[PDB]
């Protein structure tokens, strides 16, 4: 039902970037994993949803 | 010949260099290239890296779990990350078409079979049916 | 008599120059050519080089030019204690 | 290697310290007997280690190994190439 | 064509350039002597160019090779038919 | 030895002239008729000629009449730098 019903969509899973700042607790404005964002991304994982 | 390209043929091979843990180059169809390694440790899985340029102080590659596809090794070509070379500076690729013409004037295409160069720096290029080199001139880059 | 030993990492970047010259780039255009040098390594054009800022992207046109050699100007203070006896 | 460097001397002090036990002093009392000891070598009991101190008060216990104790700082940079 | 016209120097100075490397001076030390270089030809250091500033102080280095750098704006209208 | 130049425009306005009178208009009625003149370029019936501002409708009657002579008037600034030598 569900991959029927559905339309197929990239899955990547989101975790926090190590290049947050230590000290206040906010990210750095630029790096290759994260555009600014403070939360970084896994490769992505085809899915049906 | 140039030294530019030693690509691998049996895949057979490159898991038995992914065992030994040596680090592989993987070309993409209009798509960046990839790196790709076998993690350490107790727990054995494939990782891969966006990531191109050599490690050093200033660079450091970003390695990640990734589901490879056998597919894509045996088809894609492969090579040795150490032992890669940027670009060679020829006009035309390997295995890119090209249109030239034929001992009796007539025209036809073909793919490049082989690049080669002189000690002087003129490159000379061998295509698929023919066994003489032609000149960069000579041949002519067909339109996708 | 090195009783105890410590150190410490105050300053981690790289600074350029150029083979040739011996000078040490300061400056650069929109296109990120070189404008500016000094013989100065206190006034360079540095570019941080802590954990966090590796793998940078504001000086790829640079860093691939031939002429220019990266190094890593590190800063570092140690902190030794000494037992003399009496 | 180095490019530029220079050495400074932070402190210089005399830290008792028991010849039994072997733990220095922390706290002592009124006439400066020992109370207290700790096996920490920097918070020890210390004292300036020059002549004129010395000539105005080894004078507490007869446990008479004090120790000189020098701190050396060393600021220096590097220019590690490629 | 031109309806009116007037001419006016806003600056007139002179300019210090190397004679091997070619780059412009940008920066200098106590005595005036270089220490950083630019590519710029405005930019480049400078002073007054008249005899007065020259009596008064070439005098740095024996790269002797002064630019006289003279900027001229100029105001103009036009009436373009059709 | 002219070391480098560039250009500024200020101002660009249309201006109009009679044929025959010579004189520049200043002010229109309702209907848009020419109700006053003078003989002064800096005083005039201006109509902005920028980039944002063509395909104007406001002058579209004065536009049409065969006596008046439109004319471009373009202000500009030019900065023209010299090297001399020594
Ligand atoms: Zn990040």
């Not at chain 2, 790196?35 to 899985?45: A, E, Q, T, Y």
Request: charged share 30%.
């Amino acid at each position: 039902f569900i991959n029927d019903r559905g339309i197929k969509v990239l899955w990547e899973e989101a975790y926090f970037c190590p290049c947050l700042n230590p000290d206040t607790g906010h990210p750095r404005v630029d790096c290759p994993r994260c555009h600014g964002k403070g939360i970084a991304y896994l490769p992505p994982k085809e899915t049906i949803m | 010949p140039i030294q530019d390209a030693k690509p691998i043929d049996d895949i057979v091979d490159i898991m038995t260099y992914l065992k030994n843990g040596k680090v592989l180059r993987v070309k993409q169809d209009n798509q960046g290239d990839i790196l790709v390694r076998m993690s350490p440790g107790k727990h054995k899985f494939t990782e891969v890296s966006r990531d191109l340029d050599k490690e050093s102080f200033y660079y450091k590659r970003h390695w990640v779990l990734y589901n490879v596809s056998v597919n894509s090794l045996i088809t894609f070509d492969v090579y040795l990350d150490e032992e890669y070379s940027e670009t060679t500076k020829v006009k035309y690729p390997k295995d890119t078409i090209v249109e030239y013409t034929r001992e009796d004037q007539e025209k036809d295409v073909a793919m490049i079979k082989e690049i080669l160069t002189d000690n002087n720096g003129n490159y000379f290029y061998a295509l698929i049916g023919e066994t003489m080199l032609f000149d960069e001139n000579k041949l002519n880059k067909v339109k996708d | 008599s090195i009783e105890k030993k410590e150190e410490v990492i105050a300053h981690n970047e790289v600074v350029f120059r150029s083979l040739t010259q011996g000078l040490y780039v300061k400056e650069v255009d929109i296109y990120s050519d070189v404008v500016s040098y000094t013989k100065d390594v206190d006034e360079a054009l540095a570019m941080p080089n802590t954990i966090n800022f590796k793998n940078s992207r504001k000086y790829k046109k640079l860093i691939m030019n031939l002429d220019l050699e990266p190094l890593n100007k590190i800063q570092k203070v140690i902190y030794e204690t000494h037992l003399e006896g009496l």
